[PDB]
From a paper:
[name]-[name] in complex with nitrate was crystallized in a buffer at pH 7.5, and its structure was resolved by X-ray crystallography to a resolution of 1.3 Å. According to the Matthews coefficient, the unit cell accommodates three chains. Chains A and B of the unit cell form a dimer, whereas chain C forms another dimer with a symmetry-related chain. The [name]-[name] monomer is composed of 4 α-helices that pack into a 4-helix bundle. Dimerization is achieved through the interaction of 22 residues of chains A and B that establish 16 hydrogen bonds and occlude a surface of approximately 1,100 Å2 in each monomer. A single molecule of nitrate is bound to a site with a positive surface charge at the dimer interface. The binding site is situated on the dimer symmetry axis; consequently, the same amino acids from the two monomers establish interactions with bound nitrate. Whereas G58, A59, and M62 establish nonbonded contacts, R61 played a key role in recognition since it forms two hydrogen bonds with nitrate. Taken together, the data indicate that [name]-[name] was present in a monomer-dimer equilibrium and that nitrate binding stabilized the dimeric state. In contrast, a single molecule of nitrate binds to a single site located at the dimer symmetry axis of [name]-[name].
Here we show that [name] PAO1 mediates nitrate chemotaxis on the basis of specific nitrate sensing by the periplasmic [name] domain of the PA2788/[name] chemoreceptor. In contrast to the NarX and NarQ sensor kinases, [name] bound nitrate specifically and showed no affinity for other ligands such as nitrite. Following the demonstration that PA2788 specifically binds nitrate, this chemoreceptor was named [name]. No nitrate chemotaxis was observed for the [name] mutant, suggesting that it is the sole nitrate chemotaxis receptor.
Residue numbers in the entry:
A (entry chain A): 14 to 139
B (entry chain B): 14 to 138
The structure:
């Protein structure tokens, strides 16, 4: 591997975080949740996204400048912005939302994050 | 690396699957879910757990026999068995369930899956 294992770990964990935040938001919709937990999960995702975009030497996350990888990070980022806004709405018990649309979007983001991991691994691995 | 990168990918994805299942079960609790999706996610976790325990040549998942890794897979399996049962309760809109208990247990399983990934990576480089 040309990148650190931690780089691939952080990218893979984005997949998990996307799902964790959805569960936390749905639990908030049910009135049994914790806004602090949701915020913290979203913050972990965003911290990792910035680390993957810029590199983070302290955290041992490599910036991968390959154009296809950078393009996939940007594709992910556009989906993420819309998903993040949906999370905020889902988490409010009294809001109007489309829960099937939310689920579809969670699955879409997950797929694009998995695609990011795949591209990173292809470039990194022998 | 002594193990295939796919081995680490599959172990990491178990973290994700544990959380996807919770998302799906809560969607079902809210009447906006899909039982087939939850079933598929559970099945994927179970196949991957089997692959990590035994190896799977077709899928390029390597065996890792180090005692600490085997012990952690066993620890995960005990938590998983209990978690899996909780899912069915959560997913029923009309059940009485303790959702905070469920989320705590989801986070516990996630942590042990993360610990498994860490142990695997340490051994693999
Ligand atoms: Na919550
Ligand atoms: Na083994
Ligand atoms: Na097992």
């Amino acid at each position: 591997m040309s990148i650190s294992p931690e780089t691939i770990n952080v990218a893979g964990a984005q997949r998990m975080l996307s799902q964790k935040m959805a569960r936390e938001a749905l639990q908030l919709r049910l009135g049994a949740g914790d806004p602090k937990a949701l915020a913290a999960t979203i913050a972990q995702y965003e911290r990792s996204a910035a680390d993957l975009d810029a590199g983070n030497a302290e955290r041992n996350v490599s910036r991968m400048g390959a154009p296809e990888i950078a393009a996939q990070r940007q594709k992910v980022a556009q989906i993420w912005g819309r998903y993040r806004a949906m999370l905020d709405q889902v988490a409010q018990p009294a809001s109007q939302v489309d829960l099937r649309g939310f689920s579809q979007y969670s699955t879409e983001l997950l797929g694009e994050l998995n695609n990011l991991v795949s591209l990173m691994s292809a470039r990194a691995d022998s």
